[PDB]
From Swiss-Prot, chain B:
UniProt activity-regulation remark: The hexamer is activated by RLP24 during pre-60S ribosomal particle maturation; RLP24 activates ATPase activity of both ATP-binding regions and increases cooperativity between AFG2 subunits. The second ATP-binding region is inhibited by diazaborine; the inhibition requires prior ATP binding specifically to the second ATP-binding region.
Family annotation (PROSITE patterns): AAA (PS00674)
Binding site for ATP 2: 516-523
SUPFAM superfamilies: P-loop containing nucleoside triphosphate hydrolases
UniProt key word Ribonucleoprotein: no
Subunit structure: Homohexamer; ATP binding induces oligomerization. Forms a ring-shaped particle of about 12 nm diameter, that displays 6-fold radial symmetry. Associates with cytoplasmic pre-60S ribosomal particles containing ARX1, ALB1, RLP24 and NOG1. Binds to pre-60S ribosomal particles soon after their export from the nucleus and is released before REI1 and LSG1 are incorporated into the particles. Hexameric form interacts with RLP24 (via C-terminal); the interaction recruits AFG2 to pre-60S ribosomal particles and promotes AFG2 ATPase activity and RLP24 release from pre-60S ribosomal particles.
Protein name: ATPase family gene 2 protein
Cellular location(s): Cytoplasm
A GO molecular function held by the record: ATP hydrolysis activity
One of the protein's GO biological processes: ribosomal large subunit biogenesis
């Protein structure tokens, strides 16, 4: 009458060897399945088309019905999660026979021979020899200690029913305390014809480091050393929040911490727990939390927190609402005194979630994962080539650097899709052209990867912070004094915060950039961000503007919080002369409110010493008098049009592709003639000259002086001395 | 106590001979439960379409599971039994009376099989349970001449008392070793239409979409026929195929086409029919269906109308069935096996209708888009449909087909079938009304009925964002070669200079501006570029993009830009920029300013679009903000002023082609010289009104006189003033 429907796994205690197929099952469950205890058992493991045949035994009536024993060896073989949902069914037909069985000798160079001493008997002592191959701990093997394990992936036995997946094998050996035609062979990875499930490993995870070690420490302190942390009495945290842009790495991290942990875990299925009646949901959450704190080793996983816990202030949806948030808060407030419980919550956007009450008291650990930079993307591509192995492709390292540099706005989720699409379109190209040629010779090249990155069309370009392409000082066309000025401005806070703490002077934290719209106002920010090596946030003027009232204020507050969380860094605004005006040009009250809020955040009733505020403007009249006050944005840079040296450097950089000797230009007369232009204007004139050189006979190895003269006469400067005089007058009065 | 309810099909293995028509591998327990003699005929009704296709039954060797049955690939293909359908078995019927004629058909062949025949009659009619509605047999080996030959046995002249049986199985009585009823070799046509049996759909049924069908083929039978090919890489084979497009195109038609052309196991669903009041019941049903599908290694699952069961989840919510089913589907499709050989096919109406969460590049990277057909595809589909009706039903020449294709602009395959049906019914009605029940073959298909058909069809696809602008040849193009050379160079530089630009780094200007008089040379320029370019053209009108809802134009232009980017290097055109441009002067709403900022950031902000080329044609250029009027974007400027004497003369001689020049007596030069201040549209209007003035005298005229031309010329005025031309010249000089 018990009617058991759901089952969960549990580690086998006391270690040792035992059955090595324990299957401690309550006698009531034994009678419920209408199968004698002296027979095999099957685990449904809900889905995945995975059925296992394993010998079954009985428990001592103390073992609870809810949890079952399956042995860590079988759990590792079948990738059974320590906490996944399981079922029970009737046993299937016995396997026919086993033929070869061969050791694998993973995570090592193999070549043991002498210290082997008939491992076959110990490996096959258990009746549960399986096709995927059992995994055993080192235990004790003569001298040398160390850890060695072998797997039985490869064999030559076939079973008629294709429904059965693990298709266990039996043993029949002669000995005390020789298989069939030897068994020791192979030293490579697992068999690929059977394609054993190998989802992840720590060797694979390398994209993020500064976050992965931080979160590893955060999750290991409450569990591995609970008494040491609880001795102080500050209580152990029970909440970890993971957030980031879509496509980043959070699901791999939760899967890794689930797989690498031999302790019990609790993973929910998402919004499926929501039912028509709230009573069923309440009972389910009560039961899962009871299972959680009943056993000391337990980890709780929550995914899609926003869907489970919608914001209360955003909308009054009803039904599933903040009541479940309150009941879970009461649950995690008092599970025990010290305990060992860690909860991982990964959400796409904390804004959708309600952080109004979460941040103050229930948790104080922040985990932020951003889009990979050049180094992280390069590392991910390198690891991709690593587990792809060179037996299937060849590509040089500088090609890897080129691909990493080209891929800037891509997300971590995009690279695997790029690899898969490259593989499929390369093989379809081979089928179309070479007419079913061997795939080994075709392998992977560079042109297919280039086509894939051209035609992928990523959708992750839209984001709150713009990661501008990295440029070095070579691309900067300017003067040495300006470079020294920005070097001083970016070096004073980071290298003098400790000095200012004792001095009590801090820094102005304000830089204003005004000048011609030609150049030296946007690319210089990228160059300084690249050279400093600090986090850089770039947002445009109209980009933050929104039709809804207060959306711009919310975005500004969010970016300010991100800058605060991202350590002392520099924040830059691309275009300020559209939001700055309040009286010169007509505007709505939202602009005035935003201006007041940003002024208060900069220099009102609080001081943001860590961050540095730098802004660029095109017309100085739009800046309000309140913002244009001493103590805020006091520093001003003329940053006028590039001089002869800067224009000459830009021309030399742009002429690198062409041949200067063949052209015959001295690179000085052109610079002298081109005196009233700007860096962007110089680039446009160079492009026009190249076009005028290439319409003659398509590709050209050099550009003639006639093309340069035609380009120069075709395009006008478009700049008047009146604006320069106005800028000089503004500079003089300031 | 087994209580069998449902059965499914599976191809007969081991080849051999066996029964080859009446295998019927069913467990003896099922036969005993039905109280039916195993040595007798079996009747499986497959739910619906009565006739039950009576077939003789036999027994298995106790290794055939009850849930699956066999009825031979020949009968499966003839009776439209797709591999993986629903089969329902019931009690046997009465014995067949007799077979009378049976006649071969020689499908997909020229017949004349007497040389390699070698008594085909024995090999066909010796097998038990031969049924008239069709036998298909593999070539095997018939002496020399190899190749493959097949026959059609559908036609017969036998009548059965019960009309319910549409398959009317008949017995056989042969006399030979290793003679019919008065020979059997006759005719060369297709199966008789009076049987009205369903016919399989092949790749000849589809046309005009060769690249899309070839790509989706390659993509669908690279996994299935070569699982080891994808297993070798180890990066797992993708299982995401998305069918999205306007309704009535035929992606679902092609879905059943590729289902029929593949002999592997397939599955079909009704969509929201699985949804029930119990979530657990639906989960159990779907998991059981998926387990049955994955029980056999070769299997295909088809999903149709996914938006109902896959909410976007980006906005609002609902209840009962929600994104939980999407999550469980994702979990089950992420873990059937590392390599596997089972793919998932999904069909949807709108790209945003399907769940964006379901759209993951890791698993759903392949997407195929089926747009509305162009003139070439419309001509191809009309031609193949006309060949399907064949020359006996109608006699239509290629000129009529191309005229109909040119006339049809927004029509789709569903519209084509609708107009075909409308023409048929209009012809029937006209014949009944006038000829008083005359023979229907004599009236056949004409032009008047089809004309009334697309006059009265009223298609519902007129309102759309994707417009296939009609193309015109270079003969109708009237202008000067000065602008023609410039536009040709601009549209030819990227296509054969992309690599040169990539090496040099210059890339492309990507900016073209066309400002001129409102008369002509804008729509004509768009037609000429769309014709000569040979690349997909997207036409967006000025007032069309404007909508009452705030932000409609925002993601409208976002979607059109995404489509242009993802549709290979192409060209994008905007009809009227002078309406969206005015913000400060026109005191437009904030939506227009937001759209302008968005497009300005899209064209040349924080990204580069080298593949696509932007061409802009506007009437009033003073409303464009100075931010857009910047070097590096839309820098190229074309005067494209009023047509000169040459273009006007060409237009006049084109319009005079309908009339007779010799009878008129005009030299085609004095009229052009007199009409100098007009424009192409003005010249066309003048020609039309001159023709009208010539025809109100005595109705139809074979020529137009000079007096009528003078009357038309002096009746109206050019309407063009020198001050606007001077202002345009001043703007050109200052820009
Ligand atoms: N560091 C990485 N290296 C390689 N591939 C990665 C990496 N990070 C993410 N991916 C790719 O992105 C896919 C999805 O990533 P993942 O599921 O971890 O993202 P998530 O942000 O947690 O998910 P969601 O979008 O549901 O919030 C992975 O299956 C993999 O293909
Ligand atoms: N390539 C084609 N070959 C033959 N018939 C076609 C073709 N394309 C469309 N049709 C015709 O279109 C008609 C209706 O097509 P249907 O509405 O099923 O198109 P679909 O785009 O696949 O469907 P939907 O978008 O509604 O799911 C049918 O009569 C069919 O014969």
């Amino acid at each position: 009458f018990k009617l058991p429907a759901e089952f969960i796994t549990r580690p086998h205690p006391s270690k040792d060897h035992g059955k090595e197929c324990t299957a401690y099952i309550h006698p009531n469950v034994l009678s419920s399945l209408e199968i004698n205890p002296g027979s095999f058992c099957t685990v449904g493991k809900i889905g995945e088309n995975g059925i296992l045949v394993i010998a079954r035994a009985g428990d001592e009536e103390v073992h609870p019905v809810n949890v079952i024993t399956l042995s860590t060896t079988i759990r590792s073989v079948g990738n059974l999660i320590l906490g996944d949902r399981l079922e029970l069914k009737k046993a299937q037909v016995q396997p026919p026979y086993a033929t070869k069985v061969t050791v694998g000798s993973l995570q090592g160079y193999n070549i043991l021979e002498c210290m082997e001493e008939k491992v076959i008997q110990k490996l096959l002592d258990d009746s549960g020899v399986i096709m995927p191959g059992m995994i055993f701990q080192n235990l004790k093997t003569k001298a040398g200690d160390e850890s060695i394990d072998v797997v039985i992936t490869d064999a030559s036995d076939d079973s008629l029913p294709d429904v059965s997946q693990l298709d266990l094998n039996m043993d029949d050996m002669y000995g005390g305390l020789g298989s069939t035609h030897i068994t020791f062979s192979k030293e490579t990875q697992a068999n690929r014809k059977y394609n054993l499930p190998e989802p992840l490993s720590y060797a694979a995870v390398g994209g993020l480091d500064k976050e992965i070690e931080s979160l590893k420490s955060a999750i290991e302190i409450p569990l591995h050393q609970p008494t040491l942390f609880s001795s102080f009495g500050v209580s152990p945290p029970r909440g970890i929040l993971l957030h980031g842009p879509p496509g980043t790495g959070k699901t791999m991290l939760l899967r890794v911490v689930a797989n690498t942990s031999n302790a019990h875990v609790l993973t929910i299925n998402g919004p499926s727990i929501v039912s028509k009646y709230l009573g069923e949901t309440e009972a389910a959450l009560r039961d899962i939390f009871n299972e959680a704190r009943k056993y000391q080793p337990s980890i709780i996983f929550i995914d899609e927190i926003d869907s489970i816990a919608p914001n209360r202030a955003n909308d009054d949806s009803g039904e599933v609402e903040s009541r479940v948030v309150a009941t879970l808060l009461t649950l995690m407030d008092g599970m025990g005194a010290a305990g060992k419980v860690v909860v991982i919550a990964a959400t796409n956007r904390p804004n959708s979630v309600d952080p109004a009450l979460r941040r103050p008291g229930r948790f104080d650990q922040e985990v932020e994962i951003g889009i990979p930079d050049v180094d992280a993307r390069f590392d991910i591509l390198t690891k991709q080539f690593s587990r792809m192995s060179s037996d299937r492709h060849v590509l040089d390292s500088e090609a890897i650097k080129y691909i990493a540099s080209k891929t800037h706005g891509y997300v971590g989720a995009d690279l695997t899709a790029l690899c898969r699409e490259s593989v499929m379109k390369t093989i379809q190209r081979g089928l179309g052209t070479d007419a079913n040629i061997d795939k080994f010779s075709l392998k992977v090249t560079l042109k297919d990867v280039e086509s894939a990155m051209v035609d992928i069309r990523p959708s992750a370009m839209r984001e709150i912070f713009l990661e501008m392409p990295k440029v070095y000082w070579s691309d900067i066309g300017g003067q040495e004094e300006l470079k020294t000025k920005m070097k001083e401005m970016i070096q004073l806070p980071l290298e003098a915060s400790e000095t200012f703490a004792r001095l009590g002077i801090s820094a102005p934290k304000g830089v204003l950039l005004y000048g011609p719209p030609g150049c030296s106002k946007t690319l210089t920010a990228k160059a300084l961000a690249t050279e400093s090596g600090i986090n850089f946030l770039a947002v445009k003027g109209p980009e933050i503007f929104n039709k809804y009232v207060g959306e711009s204020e919310r975005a500004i507050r969010e970016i300010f919080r991100k800058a605060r969380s991202a350590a002392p860094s520099i924040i830059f605004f691309d275009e300020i002369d559209a939001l700055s005006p309040d009286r010169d040009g007509s505007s709505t009250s939202a602009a005035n409110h935003v201006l007041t809020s940003l002024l208060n955040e900069i220099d009102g009733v609080e001081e943001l010493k860590g961050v540095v505020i730098v802004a660029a403007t095109n017309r100085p009249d739009e800046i309000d008098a309140a913002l244009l006050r001493p103590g805020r944005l006091d520093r001003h840079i003329y940053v006028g049009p590039p001089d002869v040296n800067a224009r000459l450097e830009i021309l030399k950089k742009c002429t690198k592709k062409f041949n200067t000797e063949e052209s015959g230009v001295d690179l000085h007369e052109l610079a002298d003639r081109t005196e009233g232009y700007s860096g962007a204007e110089v680039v446009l004139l160079c492009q026009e000259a190249g076009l005028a050189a290439i319409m003659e006979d398509l590709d050209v190895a050099k550009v003639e002086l006639r093309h340069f003269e035609k380009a120069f006469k075709g395009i006008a400067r478009g700049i008047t001395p009146e604006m320069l005089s106005y800028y000089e007058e503004f500079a003089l009065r300031s």
